[PDB]
Amino acid sequence: EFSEWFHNILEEAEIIDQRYPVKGMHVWMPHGFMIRKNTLKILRRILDRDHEEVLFPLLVPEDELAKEAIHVKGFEDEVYWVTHGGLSKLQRKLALRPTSETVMYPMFALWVRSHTDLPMRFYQVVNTFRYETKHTRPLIRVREITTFKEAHTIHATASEAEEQVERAVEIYKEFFNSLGIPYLITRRPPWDKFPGSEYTVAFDTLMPDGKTLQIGTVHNLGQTFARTFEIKFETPEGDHEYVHQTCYGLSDRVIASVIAIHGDESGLCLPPDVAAHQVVIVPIIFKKAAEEVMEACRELRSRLEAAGFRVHLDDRDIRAGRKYYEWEMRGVPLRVEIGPRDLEKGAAVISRRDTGEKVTADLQGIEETLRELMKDILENLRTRAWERMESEIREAETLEEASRIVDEKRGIISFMWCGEEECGMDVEEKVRVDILGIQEEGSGTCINCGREAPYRAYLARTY
Amino acid sequence: EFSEWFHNILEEAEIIDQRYPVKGMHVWMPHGFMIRKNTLKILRRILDRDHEEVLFPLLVPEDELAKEAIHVKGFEDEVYWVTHGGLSKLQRKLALRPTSETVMYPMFALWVRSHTDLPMRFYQVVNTFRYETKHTRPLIRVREITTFKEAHTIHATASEAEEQVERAVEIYKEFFNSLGIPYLITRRPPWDKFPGSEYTVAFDTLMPDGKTLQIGTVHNLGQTFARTFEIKFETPEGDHEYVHQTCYGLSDRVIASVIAIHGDESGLCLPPDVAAHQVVIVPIIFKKAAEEVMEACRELRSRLEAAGFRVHLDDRDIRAGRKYYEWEMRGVPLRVEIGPRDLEKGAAVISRRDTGEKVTADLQGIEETLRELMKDILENLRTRAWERMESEIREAETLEEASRIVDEKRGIISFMWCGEEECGMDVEEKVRVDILGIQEEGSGTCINCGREAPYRAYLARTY
Ligand SMILES: C[C@H](N)C(=O)NS(=O)(=O)OC[C@H]1O[C@@H](n2cnc3c(N)ncnc32)[C@H](O)[C@@H]1O
Ligand SMILES: C[C@H](N)C(=O)NS(=O)(=O)OC[C@H]1O[C@@H](n2cnc3c(N)ncnc32)[C@H](O)[C@@H]1O
Ligand SMILES: [Mg+2]
Ligand SMILES: [Mg+2]
Ligand SMILES: [Zn+2]
Ligand SMILES: [Zn+2]
């Protein structure tokens, strides 16, 4: 049910066109692009406080890419390879970046010398490629991840690296909260962690189809990559130790989530700061003081723009009904309607997209009325969202109880787990599900082997 | 001389790092990235008035790419090819886009149906690839063009297409004027035009080494591509005719130009709206009312930010001299110095980067003082630039006179030309130079074959 909804809204709202001759690679149409644009503004506003945006190459030579032990193994048959340059065969294969560690790190080896240099915090929003699962899914599982934001940090002590991991987590919380997206933060099992990292922390959110979606990861690379690429730095004493690194990233999935989570029967419903337009002015006219209604709207649009609004006056010549539908299925938060009546009173009608509540305000201070309304809509959408999610995280004491809940209600399954490889795999297999990760807390007994359970774990059917 | 200057400023100002294991592919460091960022804001501000930004895939399948007659021939051995997906060999080669016609057009075939649909004006800023000349050059001739803005338009009548070509030209003029970049607009010879187009209009600018640099092209594709990809549309009568297309684009070269053209002995000198910072506040302190000098600067920074300035307070603990040098070689337009004296008078010192003029203004209305100063700097830089260029465009009546001027003074050579293939080639060969293009005007006699010369032509040593 959700799948069809998603696929249809992506087309109707003209977010992306999937009809491209190469599977797993979609086109961002105008509207979709605007949403992607605003989602990124929000993200960069946060990241730019303490991170420096950069832009590295797309292609990586075998030599560099394979310098990894586990990392190369982690993307082996997952990389695309350019082998020829025209008709000529390159004397050194070039791989399309799947992620940029093997691209930036050898360069970091150069950029880093003195402890005065550290800490360095970089990031970029580029396109990465991954040859995977025959199962392609829009904005969720693509071959060309068009909105891959990857951050990489460098530190002097392993201490600061961990502190960074915590900072990243706070950055994503803030990012997501702005999108009104709820999430569950856990620590991935050591066999799911980023290839070569010390550990991986992941953010997972729940899709309307009861399935979970990883929408962000933070990895603590310790000094593994440092040693691999020789990234050393001089201490104030005169020694040469390897740096401590961490990296984290999001993808188009964030945009899928926003669409999906605040999804709706009417179409898209988006946080005001993500929508292509925050306020769409629709003048109501039947050839009765039209010249006056119009100039009332125009004046309003201009007035809103100067106040910093992303407004749009829909003066097309069609039935206001059709207009309402359009901007509604597209996700515009506020609709401002103006007609002879209201006009001849100094007021207008403001309709909400999340609720439906049409209220009446004075065109005199409307700017503030709108600003407030917007703050309200986010909080509501964010709240609703959190409720909906938490109400799907259910505890289980028996592996049997789990299988029953998952299969009947889907969602997330909370449970105490011993945290052992074999036990975990066994849990996954028996329940045909994936262990999202753990959360250290009070002990108990592993839902499976009954032994001592140091961790609170979650599992679910994932994307 | 210029070359070394360029290469050194790119490194000293930390614009791009060229030390990447793959030739023709550079890294944008923080500072460089900020300039690229602002240059693009300026560009998008213009383009977004009537164009819709989008984002198509990177990879193109042989099938589509080769659908062209001359176009495929035009990029034959110029394309990179991904042949394997992991260890598996794809059953259909994928080419990294060199430009996106073969990517967007088949999609346009779908997006276009009714004349009500046209006109459509799209554009994107993506990374394109081109396997060319062994001679790699930063921001000028790269294998991975990291800042390729390509616009594509669709029209109902060939009439509107031409009108579009004129619009594009006006858009680039405005874009360039904002960067204070001078240019010569001409019509490329029919053997240099974009592969498959009706004709190509190009913008060329002059580099400090007397060589010319193509910094923009607008192509009128007529219905050539329409027929190739079956892009038809329904007329109000009910007929089905092919659409009229045009496309135009710029690259990182625009950023090279800005750096190079307003180049300088002190380092970078950039248009206020391109610099990483428009105003850098440097407090002068020697342990004498410091606490008061500082709070005077801070207050100023905040005050400037709220006014919309990209300001930066350099409160580092170093000699103000070293600070001046840094922000000066980096291109910051205005430096605001504050010390005990000036402070205890309600005024500060404002130094210009283009001139050097340090003036004294009242911290009371300084915002407007600065805004004005900025407008002044652009106009100056733009003017200087135009003078410098026009003073290098020299007329020649004899093929011999040309060879003498080119070889001794470089620059552009104006001349009357018959406009014939063989005659043109002959001119180029004999003078070891390239014919930039023509400009229809009063007749005369071809500098070479003496026959009737319908066009005013230019030639020079190019990049
Ligand atoms: C930051 C680290 N270098 C990185 O690459 N981590 S990652 O491999 O976990 O990817 C980061 C995020 O990208 C998203 N992602 C991964 N593969 C994807 C795919 N094929 N399609 C869409 N999003 C994907 C997920 O939300 C994931 O959390
Ligand atoms: C718009 C059309 N589809 C296009 O591709 N035209 S073009 O091939 O002429 O390229 C547009 C512009 O990109 C720049 N350009 C072309 N090849 C380049 C290269 N190898 N490195 C840097 N800039 C390049 C030039 O300034 C040129 O005017
Ligand atoms: Mg698992
Ligand atoms: Mg030529
Ligand atoms: Zn167990
Ligand atoms: Zn001639």
PDB file of all heavy atoms in Angstrom, chain B residues 75 99 101 130 132 139-142 145 148 150 152 194 214-217 219 247-253, ligand 2:
ATOM      1  N   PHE B  75      32.709  13.107 -29.895  1.00  0.00           N
ATOM      2  CA  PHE B  75      33.209  12.706 -28.579  1.00  0.00           C
ATOM      3  C   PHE B  75      33.691  11.246 -28.561  1.00  0.00           C
ATOM      4  O   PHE B  75      34.025  10.702 -27.508  1.00  0.00           O
ATOM      5  CB  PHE B  75      32.126  12.917 -27.505  1.00  0.00           C
ATOM      6  CG  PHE B  75      31.739  14.365 -27.297  1.00  0.00           C
ATOM      7  CD1 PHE B  75      30.689  14.937 -28.023  1.00  0.00           C
ATOM      8  CD2 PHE B  75      32.438  15.165 -26.387  1.00  0.00           C
ATOM      9  CE1 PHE B  75      30.341  16.292 -27.844  1.00  0.00           C
ATOM     10  CE2 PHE B  75      32.099  16.519 -26.202  1.00  0.00           C
ATOM     11  CZ  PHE B  75      31.050  17.080 -26.931  1.00  0.00           C
ATOM     12  N   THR B  99      28.887  15.700 -21.691  1.00  0.00           N
ATOM     13  CA  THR B  99      27.923  16.781 -21.752  1.00  0.00           C
ATOM     14  C   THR B  99      26.643  15.953 -21.706  1.00  0.00           C
ATOM     15  O   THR B  99      26.688  14.772 -22.027  1.00  0.00           O
ATOM     16  CB  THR B  99      28.052  17.588 -23.059  1.00  0.00           C
ATOM     17  OG1 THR B  99      26.997  18.554 -23.113  1.00  0.00           O
ATOM     18  CG2 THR B  99      27.982  16.680 -24.276  1.00  0.00           C
ATOM     19  N   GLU B 101      23.465  16.016 -23.461  1.00  0.00           N
ATOM     20  CA  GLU B 101      22.421  15.920 -24.481  1.00  0.00           C
ATOM     21  C   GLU B 101      21.855  14.514 -24.583  1.00  0.00           C
ATOM     22  O   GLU B 101      20.646  14.319 -24.531  1.00  0.00           O
ATOM     23  CB  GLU B 101      22.942  16.327 -25.864  1.00  0.00           C
ATOM     24  CG  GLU B 101      23.165  17.809 -26.077  1.00  0.00           C
ATOM     25  CD  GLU B 101      24.333  18.330 -25.285  1.00  0.00           C
ATOM     26  OE1 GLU B 101      25.268  17.549 -25.029  1.00  0.00           O
ATOM     27  OE2 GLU B 101      24.325  19.523 -24.933  1.00  0.00           O
ATOM     28  N   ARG B 130      35.932  14.441 -19.747  1.00  0.00           N
ATOM     29  CA  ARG B 130      36.426  14.499 -21.114  1.00  0.00           C
ATOM     30  C   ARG B 130      37.874  14.069 -21.207  1.00  0.00           C
ATOM     31  O   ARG B 130      38.757  14.705 -20.643  1.00  0.00           O
ATOM     32  CB  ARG B 130      36.265  15.914 -21.680  1.00  0.00           C
ATOM     33  CG  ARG B 130      34.815  16.303 -21.878  1.00  0.00           C
ATOM     34  CD  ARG B 130      34.653  17.690 -22.436  1.00  0.00           C
ATOM     35  NE  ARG B 130      33.247  18.078 -22.414  1.00  0.00           N
ATOM     36  CZ  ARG B 130      32.759  19.184 -22.966  1.00  0.00           C
ATOM     37  NH1 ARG B 130      33.565  20.026 -23.594  1.00  0.00           N
ATOM     38  NH2 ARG B 130      31.461  19.455 -22.883  1.00  0.00           N
ATOM     39  N   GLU B 132      40.930  14.121 -23.013  1.00  0.00           N
ATOM     40  CA  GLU B 132      41.543  14.935 -24.059  1.00  0.00           C
ATOM     41  C   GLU B 132      43.052  15.147 -23.949  1.00  0.00           C
ATOM     42  O   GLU B 132      43.764  14.385 -23.292  1.00  0.00           O
ATOM     43  CB  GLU B 132      40.869  16.313 -24.084  1.00  0.00           C
ATOM     44  CG  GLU B 132      39.351  16.303 -24.216  1.00  0.00           C
ATOM     45  CD  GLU B 132      38.746  17.701 -24.120  1.00  0.00           C
ATOM     46  OE1 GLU B 132      38.978  18.377 -23.092  1.00  0.00           O
ATOM     47  OE2 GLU B 132      38.041  18.116 -25.067  1.00  0.00           O
ATOM     48  N   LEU B 139      41.577  24.170 -13.685  1.00  0.00           N
ATOM     49  CA  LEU B 139      40.392  24.976 -13.955  1.00  0.00           C
ATOM     50  C   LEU B 139      40.230  25.381 -15.416  1.00  0.00           C
ATOM     51  O   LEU B 139      39.255  26.047 -15.764  1.00  0.00           O
ATOM     52  CB  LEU B 139      40.421  26.262 -13.122  1.00  0.00           C
ATOM     53  CG  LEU B 139      40.524  26.188 -11.604  1.00  0.00           C
ATOM     54  CD1 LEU B 139      40.700  27.593 -11.047  1.00  0.00           C
ATOM     55  CD2 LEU B 139      39.278  25.539 -11.032  1.00  0.00           C
ATOM     56  N   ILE B 140      41.164  24.991 -16.274  1.00  0.00           N
ATOM     57  CA  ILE B 140      41.092  25.397 -17.667  1.00  0.00           C
ATOM     58  C   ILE B 140      40.940  24.249 -18.635  1.00  0.00           C
ATOM     59  O   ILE B 140      40.252  24.362 -19.643  1.00  0.00           O
ATOM     60  CB  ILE B 140      42.338  26.201 -18.037  1.00  0.00           C
ATOM     61  CG1 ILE B 140      42.394  27.450 -17.166  1.00  0.00           C
ATOM     62  CG2 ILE B 140      42.317  26.563 -19.506  1.00  0.00           C
ATOM     63  CD1 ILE B 140      43.594  28.312 -17.423  1.00  0.00           C
ATOM     64  N   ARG B 141      41.605  23.149 -18.334  1.00  0.00           N
ATOM     65  CA  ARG B 141      41.542  21.973 -19.170  1.00  0.00           C
ATOM     66  C   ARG B 141      41.698  20.795 -18.237  1.00  0.00           C
ATOM     67  O   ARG B 141      42.806  20.344 -17.973  1.00  0.00           O
ATOM     68  CB  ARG B 141      42.679  21.988 -20.180  1.00  0.00           C
ATOM     69  CG  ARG B 141      42.765  20.739 -21.024  1.00  0.00           C
ATOM     70  CD  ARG B 141      42.591  21.089 -22.474  1.00  0.00           C
ATOM     71  NE  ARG B 141      41.186  21.203 -22.850  1.00  0.00           N
ATOM     72  CZ  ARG B 141      40.737  22.012 -23.806  1.00  0.00           C
ATOM     73  NH1 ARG B 141      41.581  22.789 -24.472  1.00  0.00           N
ATOM     74  NH2 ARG B 141      39.445  22.028 -24.113  1.00  0.00           N
ATOM     75  N   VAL B 142      40.579  20.307 -17.729  1.00  0.00           N
ATOM     76  CA  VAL B 142      40.602  19.195 -16.797  1.00  0.00           C
ATOM     77  C   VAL B 142      39.878  17.995 -17.372  1.00  0.00           C
ATOM     78  O   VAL B 142      39.149  18.113 -18.351  1.00  0.00           O
ATOM     79  CB  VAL B 142      39.954  19.597 -15.449  1.00  0.00           C
ATOM     80  CG1 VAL B 142      40.842  20.601 -14.722  1.00  0.00           C
ATOM     81  CG2 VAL B 142      38.593  20.219 -15.694  1.00  0.00           C
ATOM     82  N   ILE B 145      35.505  18.019 -15.207  1.00  0.00           N
ATOM     83  CA  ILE B 145      35.082  19.400 -15.110  1.00  0.00           C
ATOM     84  C   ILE B 145      34.123  19.383 -13.941  1.00  0.00           C
ATOM     85  O   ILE B 145      32.996  18.921 -14.066  1.00  0.00           O
ATOM     86  CB  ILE B 145      34.361  19.843 -16.398  1.00  0.00           C
ATOM     87  CG1 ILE B 145      35.223  19.506 -17.618  1.00  0.00           C
ATOM     88  CG2 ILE B 145      34.103  21.341 -16.365  1.00  0.00           C
ATOM     89  CD1 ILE B 145      34.531  19.777 -18.951  1.00  0.00           C
ATOM     90  N   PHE B 148      30.499  22.247 -14.212  1.00  0.00           N
ATOM     91  CA  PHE B 148      29.922  22.362 -15.530  1.00  0.00           C
ATOM     92  C   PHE B 148      28.449  22.721 -15.479  1.00  0.00           C
ATOM     93  O   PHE B 148      27.622  21.882 -15.171  1.00  0.00           O
ATOM     94  CB  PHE B 148      30.080  21.032 -16.247  1.00  0.00           C
ATOM     95  CG  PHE B 148      29.779  21.094 -17.702  1.00  0.00           C
ATOM     96  CD1 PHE B 148      30.678  21.681 -18.583  1.00  0.00           C
ATOM     97  CD2 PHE B 148      28.607  20.545 -18.205  1.00  0.00           C
ATOM     98  CE1 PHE B 148      30.415  21.715 -19.947  1.00  0.00           C
ATOM     99  CE2 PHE B 148      28.334  20.575 -19.571  1.00  0.00           C
ATOM    100  CZ  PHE B 148      29.242  21.161 -20.442  1.00  0.00           C
ATOM    101  N   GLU B 150      25.256  23.405 -17.462  1.00  0.00           N
ATOM    102  CA  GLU B 150      24.731  23.253 -18.805  1.00  0.00           C
ATOM    103  C   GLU B 150      23.236  23.501 -18.801  1.00  0.00           C
ATOM    104  O   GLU B 150      22.521  22.925 -17.994  1.00  0.00           O
ATOM    105  CB  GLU B 150      25.033  21.849 -19.335  1.00  0.00           C
ATOM    106  CG  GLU B 150      24.457  20.723 -18.492  1.00  0.00           C
ATOM    107  CD  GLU B 150      24.786  19.346 -19.046  1.00  0.00           C
ATOM    108  OE1 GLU B 150      24.584  19.115 -20.258  1.00  0.00           O
ATOM    109  OE2 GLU B 150      25.239  18.487 -18.264  1.00  0.00           O
ATOM    110  N   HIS B 152      19.628  23.693 -21.142  1.00  0.00           N
ATOM    111  CA  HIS B 152      19.011  23.131 -22.334  1.00  0.00           C
ATOM    112  C   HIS B 152      17.605  23.673 -22.425  1.00  0.00           C
ATOM    113  O   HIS B 152      16.861  23.627 -21.450  1.00  0.00           O
ATOM    114  CB  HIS B 152      18.952  21.623 -22.218  1.00  0.00           C
ATOM    115  CG  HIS B 152      20.289  20.983 -22.075  1.00  0.00           C
ATOM    116  ND1 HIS B 152      20.845  20.199 -23.059  1.00  0.00           N
ATOM    117  CD2 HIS B 152      21.187  21.016 -21.066  1.00  0.00           C
ATOM    118  CE1 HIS B 152      22.029  19.771 -22.663  1.00  0.00           C
ATOM    119  NE2 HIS B 152      22.260  20.253 -21.457  1.00  0.00           N
ATOM    120  N   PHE B 194      29.372  23.356 -32.169  1.00  0.00           N
ATOM    121  CA  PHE B 194      29.019  22.207 -31.354  1.00  0.00           C
ATOM    122  C   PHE B 194      28.535  21.093 -32.270  1.00  0.00           C
ATOM    123  O   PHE B 194      27.692  21.302 -33.144  1.00  0.00           O
ATOM    124  CB  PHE B 194      27.920  22.585 -30.349  1.00  0.00           C
ATOM    125  CG  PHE B 194      27.612  21.507 -29.346  1.00  0.00           C
ATOM    126  CD1 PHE B 194      28.505  21.208 -28.325  1.00  0.00           C
ATOM    127  CD2 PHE B 194      26.428  20.779 -29.429  1.00  0.00           C
ATOM    128  CE1 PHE B 194      28.226  20.192 -27.395  1.00  0.00           C
ATOM    129  CE2 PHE B 194      26.137  19.764 -28.509  1.00  0.00           C
ATOM    130  CZ  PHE B 194      27.039  19.470 -27.490  1.00  0.00           C
ATOM    131  N   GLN B 214      38.133  30.385 -24.045  1.00  0.00           N
ATOM    132  CA  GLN B 214      36.692  30.268 -24.274  1.00  0.00           C
ATOM    133  C   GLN B 214      36.017  30.102 -22.913  1.00  0.00           C
ATOM    134  O   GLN B 214      36.279  29.134 -22.205  1.00  0.00           O
ATOM    135  CB  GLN B 214      36.408  29.041 -25.126  1.00  0.00           C
ATOM    136  CG  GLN B 214      35.022  28.962 -25.700  1.00  0.00           C
ATOM    137  CD  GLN B 214      34.845  27.709 -26.545  1.00  0.00           C
ATOM    138  OE1 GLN B 214      34.664  26.606 -26.014  1.00  0.00           O
ATOM    139  NE2 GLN B 214      34.923  27.869 -27.871  1.00  0.00           N
ATOM    140  N   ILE B 215      35.157  31.038 -22.534  1.00  0.00           N
ATOM    141  CA  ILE B 215      34.508  30.940 -21.243  1.00  0.00           C
ATOM    142  C   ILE B 215      33.002  30.821 -21.316  1.00  0.00           C
ATOM    143  O   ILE B 215      32.309  31.169 -20.367  1.00  0.00           O
ATOM    144  CB  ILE B 215      34.847  32.140 -20.358  1.00  0.00           C
ATOM    145  CG1 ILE B 215      34.434  33.434 -21.052  1.00  0.00           C
ATOM    146  CG2 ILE B 215      36.323  32.136 -20.043  1.00  0.00           C
ATOM    147  CD1 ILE B 215      34.718  34.672 -20.230  1.00  0.00           C
ATOM    148  N   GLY B 216      32.490  30.322 -22.430  1.00  0.00           N
ATOM    149  CA  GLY B 216      31.054  30.172 -22.559  1.00  0.00           C
ATOM    150  C   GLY B 216      30.624  29.952 -23.991  1.00  0.00           C
ATOM    151  O   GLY B 216      31.196  30.536 -24.902  1.00  0.00           O
ATOM    152  N   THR B 217      29.625  29.103 -24.198  1.00  0.00           N
ATOM    153  CA  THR B 217      29.133  28.844 -25.538  1.00  0.00           C
ATOM    154  C   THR B 217      27.630  28.678 -25.508  1.00  0.00           C
ATOM    155  O   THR B 217      27.070  28.195 -24.525  1.00  0.00           O
ATOM    156  CB  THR B 217      29.748  27.581 -26.129  1.00  0.00           C
ATOM    157  OG1 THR B 217      29.501  26.482 -25.248  1.00  0.00           O
ATOM    158  CG2 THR B 217      31.247  27.749 -26.301  1.00  0.00           C
ATOM    159  N   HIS B 219      24.595  27.281 -28.123  1.00  0.00           N
ATOM    160  CA  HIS B 219      24.400  26.576 -29.373  1.00  0.00           C
ATOM    161  C   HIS B 219      22.946  26.550 -29.769  1.00  0.00           C
ATOM    162  O   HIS B 219      22.071  26.446 -28.924  1.00  0.00           O
ATOM    163  CB  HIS B 219      24.896  25.138 -29.247  1.00  0.00           C
ATOM    164  CG  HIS B 219      26.232  25.025 -28.591  1.00  0.00           C
ATOM    165  ND1 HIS B 219      27.380  25.550 -29.145  1.00  0.00           N
ATOM    166  CD2 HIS B 219      26.600  24.481 -27.407  1.00  0.00           C
ATOM    167  CE1 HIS B 219      28.397  25.335 -28.328  1.00  0.00           C
ATOM    168  NE2 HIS B 219      27.950  24.689 -27.266  1.00  0.00           N
ATOM    169  N   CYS B 247      21.129  25.101 -26.389  1.00  0.00           N
ATOM    170  CA  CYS B 247      21.777  24.747 -25.136  1.00  0.00           C
ATOM    171  C   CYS B 247      23.017  25.598 -24.983  1.00  0.00           C
ATOM    172  O   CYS B 247      23.618  25.988 -25.972  1.00  0.00           O
ATOM    173  CB  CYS B 247      22.137  23.256 -25.106  1.00  0.00           C
ATOM    174  SG  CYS B 247      23.488  22.746 -26.177  1.00  0.00           S
ATOM    175  N   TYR B 248      23.391  25.900 -23.744  1.00  0.00           N
ATOM    176  CA  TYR B 248      24.570  26.716 -23.483  1.00  0.00           C
ATOM    177  C   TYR B 248      25.232  26.349 -22.160  1.00  0.00           C
ATOM    178  O   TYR B 248      24.581  25.795 -21.281  1.00  0.00           O
ATOM    179  CB  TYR B 248      24.186  28.193 -23.516  1.00  0.00           C
ATOM    180  CG  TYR B 248      22.801  28.496 -23.005  1.00  0.00           C
ATOM    181  CD1 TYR B 248      22.612  29.135 -21.779  1.00  0.00           C
ATOM    182  CD2 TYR B 248      21.675  28.184 -23.762  1.00  0.00           C
ATOM    183  CE1 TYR B 248      21.331  29.464 -21.323  1.00  0.00           C
ATOM    184  CE2 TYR B 248      20.388  28.505 -23.314  1.00  0.00           C
ATOM    185  CZ  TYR B 248      20.225  29.149 -22.095  1.00  0.00           C
ATOM    186  OH  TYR B 248      18.962  29.501 -21.654  1.00  0.00           O
ATOM    187  N   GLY B 249      26.522  26.642 -22.017  1.00  0.00           N
ATOM    188  CA  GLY B 249      27.200  26.286 -20.783  1.00  0.00           C
ATOM    189  C   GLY B 249      28.526  26.955 -20.460  1.00  0.00           C
ATOM    190  O   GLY B 249      29.191  27.489 -21.328  1.00  0.00           O
ATOM    191  N   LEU B 250      28.898  26.899 -19.185  1.00  0.00           N
ATOM    192  CA  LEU B 250      30.125  27.482 -18.657  1.00  0.00           C
ATOM    193  C   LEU B 250      30.792  26.390 -17.853  1.00  0.00           C
ATOM    194  O   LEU B 250      30.185  25.353 -17.607  1.00  0.00           O
ATOM    195  CB  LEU B 250      29.800  28.604 -17.680  1.00  0.00           C
ATOM    196  CG  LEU B 250      28.617  29.492 -18.018  1.00  0.00           C
ATOM    197  CD1 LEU B 250      28.214  30.313 -16.802  1.00  0.00           C
ATOM    198  CD2 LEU B 250      29.004  30.368 -19.194  1.00  0.00           C
ATOM    199  N   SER B 251      32.026  26.628 -17.416  1.00  0.00           N
ATOM    200  CA  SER B 251      32.722  25.647 -16.600  1.00  0.00           C
ATOM    201  C   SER B 251      33.575  26.335 -15.547  1.00  0.00           C
ATOM    202  O   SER B 251      33.409  27.520 -15.279  1.00  0.00           O
ATOM    203  CB  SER B 251      33.600  24.762 -17.468  1.00  0.00           C
ATOM    204  OG  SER B 251      34.780  25.446 -17.822  1.00  0.00           O
ATOM    205  N   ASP B 252      34.487  25.583 -14.947  1.00  0.00           N
ATOM    206  CA  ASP B 252      35.369  26.123 -13.924  1.00  0.00           C
ATOM    207  C   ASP B 252      36.188  27.258 -14.509  1.00  0.00           C
ATOM    208  O   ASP B 252      36.732  28.081 -13.771  1.00  0.00           O
ATOM    209  CB  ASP B 252      36.306  25.039 -13.419  1.00  0.00           C
ATOM    210  CG  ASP B 252      35.575  23.768 -13.055  1.00  0.00           C
ATOM    211  OD1 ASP B 252      34.980  23.147 -13.961  1.00  0.00           O
ATOM    212  OD2 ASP B 252      35.594  23.388 -11.864  1.00  0.00           O
ATOM    213  N   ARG B 253      36.281  27.295 -15.834  1.00  0.00           N
ATOM    214  CA  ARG B 253      37.031  28.343 -16.505  1.00  0.00           C
ATOM    215  C   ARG B 253      36.597  29.711 -16.047  1.00  0.00           C
ATOM    216  O   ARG B 253      37.404  30.623 -15.945  1.00  0.00           O
ATOM    217  CB  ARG B 253      36.872  28.236 -18.009  1.00  0.00           C
ATOM    218  CG  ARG B 253      37.752  27.161 -18.598  1.00  0.00           C
ATOM    219  CD  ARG B 253      37.554  27.058 -20.077  1.00  0.00           C
ATOM    220  NE  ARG B 253      38.522  26.158 -20.683  1.00  0.00           N
ATOM    221  CZ  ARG B 253      38.608  25.943 -21.989  1.00  0.00           C
ATOM    222  NH1 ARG B 253      37.780  26.568 -22.816  1.00  0.00           N
ATOM    223  NH2 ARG B 253      39.514  25.101 -22.463  1.00  0.00           N
TER     224      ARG B 253
HETATM  225  C1  LIG C   2      26.419  23.506 -23.648  1.00  0.00           C
HETATM  226  C2  LIG C   2      26.998  22.396 -24.534  1.00  0.00           C
HETATM  227  N1  LIG C   2      26.279  21.144 -24.341  1.00  0.00           N
HETATM  228  C3  LIG C   2      28.424  22.184 -24.126  1.00  0.00           C
HETATM  229  O1  LIG C   2      28.899  21.155 -23.711  1.00  0.00           O
HETATM  230  N2  LIG C   2      29.262  23.046 -24.783  1.00  0.00           N
HETATM  231  S1  LIG C   2      30.873  22.956 -24.798  1.00  0.00           S
HETATM  232  O2  LIG C   2      31.310  21.598 -25.175  1.00  0.00           O
HETATM  233  O3  LIG C   2      31.291  24.103 -25.675  1.00  0.00           O
HETATM  234  O4  LIG C   2      31.372  23.292 -23.319  1.00  0.00           O
HETATM  235  C4  LIG C   2      30.913  24.481 -22.661  1.00  0.00           C
HETATM  236  C5  LIG C   2      32.044  25.238 -21.998  1.00  0.00           C
HETATM  237  O5  LIG C   2      32.772  24.385 -21.069  1.00  0.00           O
HETATM  238  C6  LIG C   2      34.143  24.775 -21.024  1.00  0.00           C
HETATM  239  N3  LIG C   2      34.986  23.579 -21.261  1.00  0.00           N
HETATM  240  C7  LIG C   2      34.957  22.675 -22.309  1.00  0.00           C
HETATM  241  N4  LIG C   2      35.849  21.705 -22.204  1.00  0.00           N
HETATM  242  C8  LIG C   2      36.512  21.979 -21.016  1.00  0.00           C
HETATM  243  C9  LIG C   2      37.581  21.325 -20.314  1.00  0.00           C
HETATM  244  N5  LIG C   2      38.177  20.211 -20.753  1.00  0.00           N
HETATM  245  N6  LIG C   2      38.017  21.871 -19.126  1.00  0.00           N
HETATM  246  C10 LIG C   2      37.419  23.005 -18.661  1.00  0.00           C
HETATM  247  N7  LIG C   2      36.408  23.705 -19.233  1.00  0.00           N
HETATM  248  C11 LIG C   2      35.995  23.137 -20.416  1.00  0.00           C
HETATM  249  C12 LIG C   2      34.330  25.919 -22.007  1.00  0.00           C
HETATM  250  O6  LIG C   2      34.418  27.167 -21.330  1.00  0.00           O
HETATM  251  C13 LIG C   2      33.115  25.788 -22.920  1.00  0.00           C
HETATM  252  O7  LIG C   2      32.686  27.022 -23.498  1.00  0.00           O
END
